[PDB]
Coordinates of C-alpha atoms in Angstrom, one line a residue:
Chain A
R13 CA 36.2 -10.6 -0.1
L14 CA 32.4 -10.2 -0.3
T15 CA 30.5 -9.1 2.8
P16 CA 27.8 -11.6 3.6
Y17 CA 24.4 -9.9 3.3
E18 CA 23.0 -10.0 6.9
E19 CA 26.4 -8.6 8.1
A20 CA 26.3 -5.8 5.6
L21 CA 22.7 -4.9 6.6
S22 CA 23.7 -4.6 10.2
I23 CA 26.6 -2.3 9.4
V24 CA 24.4 0.1 7.5
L25 CA 21.7 -0.1 10.1
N26 CA 24.1 0.4 13.1
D27 CA 25.5 3.4 11.3
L28 CA 22.2 5.3 11.2
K29 CA 20.3 7.0 14.0
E30 CA 16.5 7.5 14.0
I31 CA 15.9 11.1 13.1
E32 CA 14.3 13.0 16.1
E33 CA 12.9 15.8 14.0
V34 CA 9.2 16.1 14.7
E35 CA 6.7 18.2 12.8
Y36 CA 2.9 18.9 13.1
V37 CA 0.4 18.5 10.4
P38 CA -3.4 18.6 10.2
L39 CA -5.2 15.2 10.3
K40 CA -6.1 15.3 6.5
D41 CA -2.4 15.6 5.6
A42 CA -1.2 12.8 8.1
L43 CA -2.2 9.8 5.9
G44 CA 1.0 7.7 5.2
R45 CA 3.1 9.7 7.7
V46 CA 5.0 8.1 10.6
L47 CA 3.7 8.9 14.1
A48 CA 6.5 10.7 15.9
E49 CA 5.6 9.7 19.5
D50 CA 3.1 7.6 21.5
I51 CA -0.4 9.1 21.8
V52 CA -1.9 8.7 25.2
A53 CA -5.7 8.8 25.6
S54 CA -6.4 11.9 27.8
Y55 CA -9.9 10.7 28.5
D56 CA -12.1 7.6 28.0
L57 CA -14.0 6.4 24.9
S149 CA -21.4 -1.3 27.4
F150 CA -19.6 -0.1 30.5
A151 CA -17.2 2.1 28.6
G152 CA -13.5 2.6 28.3
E153 CA -13.7 -0.3 25.8
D154 CA -12.2 1.6 22.9
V155 CA -9.2 3.1 24.9
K156 CA -8.8 4.1 28.5
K157 CA -7.3 7.3 29.8
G158 CA -3.5 6.8 30.2
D159 CA -3.4 3.9 27.7
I160 CA -1.3 4.3 24.6
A161 CA -3.8 4.8 21.8
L162 CA -1.2 4.6 19.0
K163 CA 2.4 3.7 19.2
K164 CA 5.5 5.6 18.0
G165 CA 6.3 4.8 14.4
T166 CA 2.8 3.9 13.4
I167 CA 2.4 4.5 9.6
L168 CA -0.9 6.3 9.8
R169 CA -3.8 4.7 8.0
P170 CA -7.4 5.9 7.6
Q171 CA -8.6 4.3 10.9
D172 CA -5.6 5.8 12.7
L173 CA -6.8 9.3 11.6
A174 CA -10.3 8.3 12.8
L175 CA -9.0 7.4 16.2
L176 CA -6.9 10.6 16.5
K177 CA -9.9 12.7 15.6
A178 CA -12.0 10.9 18.3
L179 CA -9.2 11.9 20.8
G180 CA -9.4 15.5 19.8
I181 CA -5.9 15.6 18.2
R182 CA -6.2 18.4 15.6
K183 CA -2.6 18.4 14.5
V184 CA -0.5 15.2 14.6
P185 CA 3.2 14.8 15.6
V186 CA 5.0 13.2 12.7
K187 CA 8.6 12.5 11.7
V188 CA 10.1 14.7 9.1
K189 CA 10.7 12.8 5.9
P190 CA 14.4 11.9 5.4
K191 CA 15.5 13.8 2.2
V192 CA 17.2 11.4 -0.1
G193 CA 19.5 12.9 -2.7
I194 CA 19.4 11.0 -6.0
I195 CA 22.4 11.2 -8.3
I196 CA 22.7 9.4 -11.6
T197 CA 26.0 8.7 -13.5
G198 CA 26.3 8.2 -17.3
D217 CA 17.8 7.1 -17.6
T218 CA 15.0 5.2 -15.8
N219 CA 16.5 4.9 -12.3
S220 CA 15.9 8.6 -11.5
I221 CA 12.2 8.1 -11.5
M222 CA 12.1 4.6 -10.2
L223 CA 14.2 5.5 -7.1
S224 CA 12.3 8.7 -6.7
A225 CA 9.0 6.7 -6.5
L226 CA 10.6 3.9 -4.4
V227 CA 11.7 6.5 -1.8
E228 CA 8.3 8.3 -1.8
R229 CA 6.6 4.9 -1.2
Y230 CA 9.0 4.3 1.7
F231 CA 8.8 7.3 4.0
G232 CA 11.4 9.5 2.2
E233 CA 11.5 12.7 0.3
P234 CA 13.2 12.3 -3.0
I235 CA 15.5 15.1 -4.0
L236 CA 16.4 14.9 -7.7
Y237 CA 19.9 16.1 -8.7
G238 CA 19.3 14.5 -12.1
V239 CA 22.3 13.2 -14.1
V240 CA 26.0 13.8 -13.6
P241 CA 28.5 12.9 -16.4
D242 CA 31.6 10.8 -15.9
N243 CA 34.0 13.3 -14.4
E244 CA 35.2 12.6 -10.9
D245 CA 35.1 16.4 -10.3
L246 CA 31.4 16.9 -11.2
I247 CA 30.5 13.6 -9.4
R248 CA 32.4 14.7 -6.3
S249 CA 30.6 18.1 -6.1
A250 CA 27.1 16.9 -6.9
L251 CA 27.8 14.2 -4.3
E252 CA 29.2 16.6 -1.6
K253 CA 26.4 18.9 -2.5
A254 CA 23.9 16.1 -2.0
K255 CA 25.5 15.1 1.3
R256 CA 25.0 18.6 2.7
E257 CA 21.4 18.8 1.5
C258 CA 20.3 15.3 2.2
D259 CA 19.9 12.9 5.1
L260 CA 20.9 10.1 2.8
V261 CA 22.3 10.0 -0.7
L262 CA 21.9 7.4 -3.5
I263 CA 24.2 7.4 -6.5
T264 CA 24.1 5.0 -9.4
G265 CA 27.2 3.7 -11.1
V279 CA 33.3 8.2 0.0
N280 CA 34.9 6.1 2.8
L281 CA 33.0 2.9 2.3
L282 CA 32.2 0.8 5.4
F283 CA 31.9 -1.9 2.7
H284 CA 31.9 -2.4 -1.1
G285 CA 30.9 -5.6 -2.8
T286 CA 28.4 -7.9 -1.2
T287 CA 26.9 -11.4 -1.7
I288 CA 23.6 -10.2 -3.1
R289 CA 22.5 -11.2 -6.6
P290 CA 21.9 -9.1 -8.5
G291 CA 23.6 -5.9 -7.3
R292 CA 26.7 -7.5 -5.7
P293 CA 28.8 -4.3 -6.2
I294 CA 26.8 -2.3 -3.7
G295 CA 28.6 -0.1 -1.2
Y296 CA 27.6 2.0 1.8
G297 CA 29.6 4.7 3.5
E298 CA 28.9 8.0 5.3
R299 CA 25.1 8.2 4.7
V300 CA 25.5 7.3 1.0
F301 CA 24.8 4.1 -1.0
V302 CA 26.7 3.5 -4.1
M303 CA 24.2 1.6 -6.2
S304 CA 24.2 -0.2 -9.5
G305 CA 23.2 1.2 -12.9
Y306 CA 21.1 -1.7 -14.0
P307 CA 17.4 -1.2 -13.0
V308 CA 16.7 -4.6 -11.6
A309 CA 19.9 -4.4 -9.6
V310 CA 19.0 -0.9 -8.4
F311 CA 15.5 -2.3 -7.4
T312 CA 17.1 -5.2 -5.5
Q313 CA 19.6 -2.9 -3.8
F314 CA 16.7 -0.6 -2.7
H315 CA 14.6 -3.4 -1.2
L316 CA 17.5 -5.2 0.5
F317 CA 19.2 -2.1 1.8
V318 CA 17.8 1.4 1.2
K319 CA 14.3 0.5 2.3
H320 CA 15.4 -0.8 5.7
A321 CA 17.8 2.2 6.1
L322 CA 14.8 4.6 5.4
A323 CA 12.7 2.8 8.1
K324 CA 15.3 3.0 10.9
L325 CA 15.8 6.7 10.1
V326 CA 12.1 7.4 10.8
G327 CA 11.2 4.7 13.3
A328 CA 8.6 3.2 11.0
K329 CA 6.9 0.0 12.2
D330 CA 5.3 -2.8 10.2
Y331 CA 6.5 -1.7 6.7
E332 CA 7.0 -5.3 5.5
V333 CA 4.5 -8.1 4.9
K334 CA 5.8 -11.6 4.6
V335 CA 3.4 -14.3 3.1
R336 CA 3.5 -18.0 2.7
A337 CA 3.6 -19.2 -0.9
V338 CA 3.9 -22.5 -2.8
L339 CA 6.3 -22.3 -5.8
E340 CA 4.9 -22.9 -9.3
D341 CA 8.4 -23.2 -10.5
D342 CA 12.0 -24.3 -9.6
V343 CA 14.3 -21.6 -8.3
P344 CA 17.8 -22.0 -9.6
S345 CA 20.4 -20.5 -7.4
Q346 CA 23.9 -21.3 -6.1
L347 CA 25.7 -21.4 -2.8
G348 CA 27.7 -18.3 -1.8
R349 CA 25.0 -15.9 -3.2
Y350 CA 22.2 -14.1 -1.4
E351 CA 19.7 -14.2 -4.2
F352 CA 16.8 -11.8 -4.8
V353 CA 14.2 -13.6 -6.9
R354 CA 11.2 -11.8 -8.5
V355 CA 7.8 -13.4 -8.2
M356 CA 4.1 -12.8 -9.0
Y357 CA 2.3 -13.8 -5.8
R358 CA -1.4 -14.7 -6.1
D359 CA -3.8 -16.8 -4.0
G360 CA -1.1 -18.7 -2.0
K361 CA 1.1 -19.3 -5.0
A362 CA 4.2 -17.7 -6.4
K363 CA 5.1 -17.7 -10.1
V364 CA 8.9 -17.3 -10.6
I365 CA 9.6 -14.7 -13.3
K366 CA 12.1 -16.2 -15.6
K367 CA 14.5 -13.5 -16.8
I372 CA 15.1 -5.8 -18.2
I373 CA 12.5 -3.8 -16.4
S374 CA 9.8 -6.3 -17.4
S375 CA 10.9 -8.7 -14.6
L376 CA 9.9 -6.1 -12.0
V377 CA 6.7 -5.1 -13.7
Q378 CA 5.6 -8.7 -14.0
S379 CA 6.3 -9.3 -10.3
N380 CA 4.7 -8.0 -7.1
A381 CA 6.9 -9.7 -4.5
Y382 CA 10.4 -11.2 -3.9
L383 CA 11.8 -14.4 -2.6
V384 CA 15.3 -14.5 -1.0
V385 CA 17.6 -17.5 -1.5
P386 CA 20.4 -17.2 1.1
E387 CA 24.1 -18.1 0.6
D388 CA 23.7 -21.6 2.1
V389 CA 20.6 -22.5 0.1
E390 CA 21.4 -23.9 -3.3
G391 CA 17.9 -23.4 -4.5
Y392 CA 14.2 -24.3 -4.2
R393 CA 12.1 -26.8 -6.0
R394 CA 8.8 -26.4 -7.8
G395 CA 6.1 -27.2 -5.3
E396 CA 7.6 -26.3 -2.0
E397 CA 6.5 -23.7 0.5
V398 CA 8.5 -20.5 1.1
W399 CA 8.3 -16.8 2.2
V400 CA 7.9 -14.0 -0.3
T401 CA 7.9 -10.3 0.7
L402 CA 5.4 -8.1 -1.1
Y403 CA 6.6 -5.0 -2.9
Chain B
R13 CA -36.0 -9.7 4.3
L14 CA -32.2 -9.3 3.8
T15 CA -30.2 -9.4 0.5
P16 CA -27.3 -11.9 0.5
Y17 CA -23.9 -10.3 0.3
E18 CA -22.7 -11.6 -3.1
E19 CA -26.1 -11.0 -4.7
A20 CA -25.9 -7.5 -3.2
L21 CA -22.4 -6.9 -4.4
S22 CA -23.0 -7.9 -8.0
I23 CA -26.0 -5.6 -8.0
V24 CA -23.8 -2.6 -7.2
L25 CA -21.0 -3.6 -9.7
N26 CA -23.4 -4.3 -12.5
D27 CA -25.2 -0.9 -12.1
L28 CA -21.8 0.8 -12.4
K29 CA -20.1 1.5 -15.7
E30 CA -16.4 2.1 -15.9
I31 CA -15.5 5.8 -16.3
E32 CA -13.7 6.2 -19.7
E33 CA -12.6 9.8 -19.1
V34 CA -8.8 10.1 -19.3
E35 CA -6.2 12.8 -18.2
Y36 CA -2.5 13.0 -19.2
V37 CA -0.2 13.5 -16.2
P38 CA 3.6 13.7 -16.0
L39 CA 5.4 10.7 -14.7
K40 CA 6.5 12.4 -11.5
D41 CA 2.9 12.6 -10.5
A42 CA 1.6 9.3 -12.0
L43 CA 2.4 7.1 -9.0
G44 CA -0.6 5.1 -7.8
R45 CA -2.9 6.2 -10.6
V46 CA -4.8 3.8 -12.9
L47 CA -3.4 3.4 -16.5
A48 CA -6.3 4.2 -18.8
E49 CA -5.3 2.1 -21.7
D50 CA -3.0 -0.7 -22.8
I51 CA 0.4 0.7 -23.7
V52 CA 2.0 -0.8 -26.7
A53 CA 5.8 -0.4 -27.2
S54 CA 7.0 1.7 -30.1
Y55 CA 10.6 0.4 -29.4
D56 CA 12.7 -2.8 -28.9
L57 CA 14.3 -2.8 -25.4
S149 CA 20.7 -11.5 -25.0
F150 CA 18.5 -10.5 -28.0
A151 CA 16.9 -7.1 -28.8
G152 CA 13.4 -6.8 -27.3
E153 CA 14.1 -9.4 -24.6
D154 CA 12.7 -6.7 -22.3
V155 CA 9.8 -5.5 -24.4
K156 CA 9.4 -6.0 -28.2
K157 CA 7.8 -3.6 -30.7
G158 CA 4.0 -4.1 -30.9
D159 CA 3.6 -5.9 -27.6
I160 CA 1.6 -4.6 -24.6
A161 CA 4.1 -3.1 -22.2
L162 CA 1.5 -2.3 -19.6
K163 CA -2.2 -3.3 -19.3
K164 CA -5.2 -1.0 -18.9
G165 CA -6.1 -0.9 -15.3
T166 CA -2.6 -1.1 -13.9
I167 CA -2.0 0.7 -10.6
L168 CA 1.2 2.3 -11.5
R169 CA 4.3 1.4 -9.4
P170 CA 7.8 2.7 -9.2
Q171 CA 8.9 0.2 -11.9
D172 CA 5.9 0.8 -14.0
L173 CA 6.9 4.4 -14.3
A174 CA 10.4 3.3 -15.1
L175 CA 9.1 1.3 -18.0
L176 CA 7.1 4.2 -19.3
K177 CA 10.2 6.5 -19.2
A178 CA 12.0 3.8 -21.2
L179 CA 9.2 3.9 -23.8
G180 CA 9.3 7.7 -24.0
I181 CA 5.9 8.3 -22.5
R182 CA 6.4 11.7 -20.7
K183 CA 2.6 12.0 -20.2
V184 CA 0.8 9.0 -19.0
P185 CA -2.9 8.5 -19.8
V186 CA -4.6 7.9 -16.4
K187 CA -8.2 7.6 -15.4
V188 CA -9.8 10.7 -14.0
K189 CA -10.4 9.9 -10.3
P190 CA -14.1 9.3 -9.6
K191 CA -15.3 12.0 -7.3
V192 CA -16.9 10.7 -4.1
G193 CA -19.3 12.9 -2.2
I194 CA -19.3 12.4 1.6
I195 CA -22.3 13.6 3.5
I196 CA -22.6 13.1 7.3
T197 CA -26.0 13.1 9.0
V216 CA -18.0 14.2 17.3
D217 CA -17.5 12.9 13.7
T218 CA -14.7 10.5 12.8
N219 CA -16.4 9.1 9.7
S220 CA -15.7 12.1 7.5
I221 CA -12.0 11.7 7.8
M222 CA -12.0 7.9 7.8
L223 CA -14.0 7.7 4.6
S224 CA -12.0 10.5 3.0
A225 CA -8.7 8.6 3.5
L226 CA -10.4 5.3 2.5
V227 CA -11.5 6.8 -0.9
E228 CA -8.1 8.5 -1.3
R229 CA -6.5 5.1 -0.7
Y230 CA -8.9 3.5 -3.2
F231 CA -8.7 5.5 -6.4
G232 CA -11.3 8.3 -5.8
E233 CA -11.3 12.0 -5.0
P234 CA -13.2 12.8 -1.8
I235 CA -15.5 15.8 -1.7
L236 CA -16.8 16.8 1.8
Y237 CA -20.2 18.3 2.1
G238 CA -20.0 18.3 5.9
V239 CA -22.7 17.4 8.4
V240 CA -26.3 18.0 7.6
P241 CA -29.2 18.1 10.1
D242 CA -31.3 15.0 10.1
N243 CA -33.8 17.2 8.3
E244 CA -35.3 15.4 5.3
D245 CA -35.4 18.6 3.1
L246 CA -31.8 19.4 4.0
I247 CA -30.8 15.8 3.2
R248 CA -32.6 15.8 -0.1
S249 CA -30.9 18.9 -1.4
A250 CA -27.5 17.9 0.1
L251 CA -27.9 14.6 -1.9
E252 CA -29.1 16.3 -5.0
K253 CA -26.0 18.6 -4.9
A254 CA -23.6 15.7 -4.5
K255 CA -25.3 13.6 -7.3
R256 CA -24.7 16.6 -9.6
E257 CA -21.1 16.9 -8.8
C258 CA -20.0 13.3 -8.1
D259 CA -19.8 9.8 -9.6
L260 CA -20.6 8.3 -6.3
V261 CA -22.1 9.5 -3.0
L262 CA -21.7 8.3 0.6
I263 CA -24.2 9.4 3.2
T264 CA -23.5 8.1 6.7
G265 CA -26.0 8.1 9.6
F278 CA -34.4 10.1 -0.9
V279 CA -33.1 7.3 -3.1
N280 CA -34.5 4.5 -5.2
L281 CA -32.5 1.7 -3.5
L282 CA -31.9 -1.5 -5.4
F283 CA -31.4 -3.1 -1.9
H284 CA -31.4 -2.1 1.7
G285 CA -30.2 -4.3 4.5
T286 CA -27.9 -7.3 3.8
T287 CA -26.5 -10.3 5.5
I288 CA -23.2 -8.7 6.5
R289 CA -22.2 -8.1 10.1
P290 CA -21.3 -5.5 11.1
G291 CA -22.9 -2.9 8.7
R292 CA -26.1 -4.7 8.0
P293 CA -28.5 -1.9 7.2
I294 CA -26.4 -0.8 4.1
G295 CA -28.2 0.3 1.0
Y296 CA -27.3 1.2 -2.5
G297 CA -29.1 2.9 -5.4
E298 CA -28.5 5.6 -8.0
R299 CA -24.8 6.1 -7.3
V300 CA -25.3 6.5 -3.5
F301 CA -24.4 4.2 -0.6
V302 CA -26.6 4.7 2.5
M303 CA -23.9 3.9 5.1
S304 CA -23.9 3.4 8.9
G305 CA -23.0 5.9 11.6
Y306 CA -20.7 3.5 13.5
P307 CA -17.0 3.7 12.6
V308 CA -16.5 -0.1 12.4
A309 CA -19.7 -0.7 10.4
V310 CA -18.6 2.1 8.0
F311 CA -15.2 0.6 7.6
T312 CA -16.8 -2.8 7.0
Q313 CA -19.2 -1.5 4.4
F314 CA -16.4 0.4 2.7
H315 CA -14.2 -2.7 2.2
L316 CA -17.1 -5.1 1.3
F317 CA -18.8 -2.6 -1.1
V318 CA -17.4 0.9 -1.7
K319 CA -13.8 -0.2 -2.4
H320 CA -15.1 -2.6 -5.1
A321 CA -17.4 0.0 -6.6
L322 CA -14.5 2.4 -6.9
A323 CA -12.3 -0.2 -8.6
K324 CA -15.1 -1.1 -11.1
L325 CA -15.4 2.7 -11.9
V326 CA -11.7 3.2 -12.6
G327 CA -11.2 -0.3 -13.9
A328 CA -8.4 -1.1 -11.4
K329 CA -6.7 -4.5 -11.6
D330 CA -5.1 -6.3 -8.6
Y331 CA -6.1 -3.9 -5.9
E332 CA -6.3 -6.6 -3.2
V333 CA -4.1 -9.3 -1.7
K334 CA -5.5 -12.6 -0.1
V335 CA -3.0 -14.4 2.1
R336 CA -3.0 -17.8 3.9
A337 CA -3.1 -17.5 7.7
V338 CA -3.3 -19.9 10.6
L339 CA -5.8 -18.7 13.2
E340 CA -4.4 -17.9 16.6
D341 CA -7.9 -17.8 18.0
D342 CA -11.5 -19.2 17.4
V343 CA -13.7 -17.2 15.1
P344 CA -17.3 -17.4 16.4
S345 CA -20.0 -16.5 14.0
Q346 CA -23.4 -17.8 13.0
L347 CA -25.2 -19.1 10.0
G348 CA -27.2 -16.5 8.1
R349 CA -24.6 -13.8 8.5
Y350 CA -21.6 -12.6 6.4
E351 CA -19.1 -11.7 9.0
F352 CA -16.3 -9.2 8.6
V353 CA -13.6 -10.2 11.2
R354 CA -10.7 -7.8 11.9
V355 CA -7.4 -9.5 12.3
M356 CA -3.7 -8.8 12.8
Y357 CA -1.8 -10.6 10.1
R358 CA 1.9 -11.3 10.6
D359 CA 4.2 -14.2 9.6
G360 CA 1.7 -16.7 8.3
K361 CA -0.4 -16.1 11.4
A362 CA -3.7 -14.2 12.0
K363 CA -4.6 -12.9 15.5
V364 CA -8.4 -12.3 16.0
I365 CA -9.2 -8.9 17.5
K366 CA -11.7 -9.2 20.3
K367 CA -14.1 -6.2 20.3
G369 CA -21.5 -1.9 13.5
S370 CA -19.6 -1.1 16.6
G371 CA -18.5 2.4 18.0
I372 CA -15.1 0.9 18.9
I373 CA -12.5 2.0 16.3
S374 CA -9.6 0.5 18.3
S375 CA -10.4 -2.9 16.7
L376 CA -9.8 -1.2 13.3
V377 CA -6.4 0.1 14.3
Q378 CA -5.2 -3.0 16.0
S379 CA -5.9 -4.9 12.7
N380 CA -4.3 -4.9 9.3
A381 CA -6.5 -7.4 7.5
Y382 CA -9.9 -9.0 7.5
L383 CA -11.4 -12.4 7.3
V384 CA -14.8 -13.2 5.9
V385 CA -17.1 -15.8 7.4
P386 CA -19.5 -16.4 4.5
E387 CA -22.9 -17.2 6.2
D388 CA -23.0 -20.9 5.2
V389 CA -20.2 -21.3 7.7
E390 CA -20.8 -21.3 11.5
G391 CA -17.3 -20.1 12.5
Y392 CA -13.7 -21.3 12.4
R393 CA -11.5 -22.9 15.0
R394 CA -8.1 -22.1 16.4
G395 CA -5.3 -23.7 14.4
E396 CA -7.3 -23.7 11.1
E397 CA -5.8 -22.0 8.0
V398 CA -7.8 -19.3 6.2
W399 CA -7.8 -16.4 3.8
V400 CA -7.4 -12.9 5.0
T401 CA -7.4 -9.8 2.9
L402 CA -4.9 -7.1 3.6
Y403 CA -6.2 -3.5 4.2

């Protein structure tokens, strides 16, 4: 009884509320951080007011601050910036490469990894580590709860579940990576109000893309200069790729030479 | 008598030798650093080694380490990764938004920023401020002395830019400074650390006309989304065009401009 992907995504997203916890940091330390509210020019910056006019929104809420954003803030006199507090993500691992991969994935995507390291196969130990993680963390990821769903149409990573602020993820690296990009990433963004975290590009396929109806497929690709090389394939598939093509459940596949969308890592 | 951009750029890159100084850092801290050397697998990781086989290069020198790159290193048992020691980049300024803009830009592009603050437009004070930065840094940026290999190029904005002896003489205008960083400093930093694949060109259909002129290498700020590029209307003291963009288009000087509806290359910030 697999939950179609888009459906599953909406469940997880509808079950999470943007965190309203604001905190203030010096400009230097604001790079990469998510702007907690609109910034309104309090004065003006060639009959001037060209840059930004008093009362206009200089930067919007959920802006992932870049070097030029810091530059603007400075020009507006803002010494300390209001930024969202990083969602703490507990990382539990059951039995080891996922611990560091997920730690880095969550750092790259607005979160604060919290590493509970490994937990052996004992439903007791697992349960405590997990309940511990649930108390300490805004969101928890455990590798293989009242699950709003378990088992999905994604490939790989079908067995994924989400319930009560926790994702039950796979144990295979590429499946963990797929699960993060198709689920966790979007969850982390809604929690912090991040805007423009994904870049979609047009690419022409250098290869065929074998798929199958009924599966939402995550395909790894090396995207370069308007072209995508499908990585035939096992961590090497992720290292040899820099982007991903999705093949929905009603698309049987794609043919060498046609144009599609890939999303950059 | 202006230097043409590409001629100018290869002058800077060819005068810079890759730093071969390495440091070993734990995996937890290796994210985004540049792998200093090819890593060959000591192990085998559906047949054995399908992932990586003994004696093969698992990761190439120059790789900007990503979450999965670190995961492969753990699999290979490399608790301490040989990474390049960040080039140190002195920032001298002659209020000021360039200090913090450049500092983040260098941070974003492989270097370690070192602030020397503002110095009076006093020639003596500039000379010693420079000399101090040359002693401590692999590269120096002065906004606002030097045996320059060129001074003034075809680029717009940021035309007066000069380079010589590890120092870029940069503009005082935010948009010119940003322009000069992406067209020159970013590349000089990459050459120094030996970074591979540090930029992404994408195809975009223009939502607007891109007016330019022959004789000038134009840096055009754009907002790229969903196969489309929106041209930002606005060096230049107006940093709002920098923030309302996420990519840039180059108009290479033997091109008068581009028209609405035409497809082009834009480079993501």
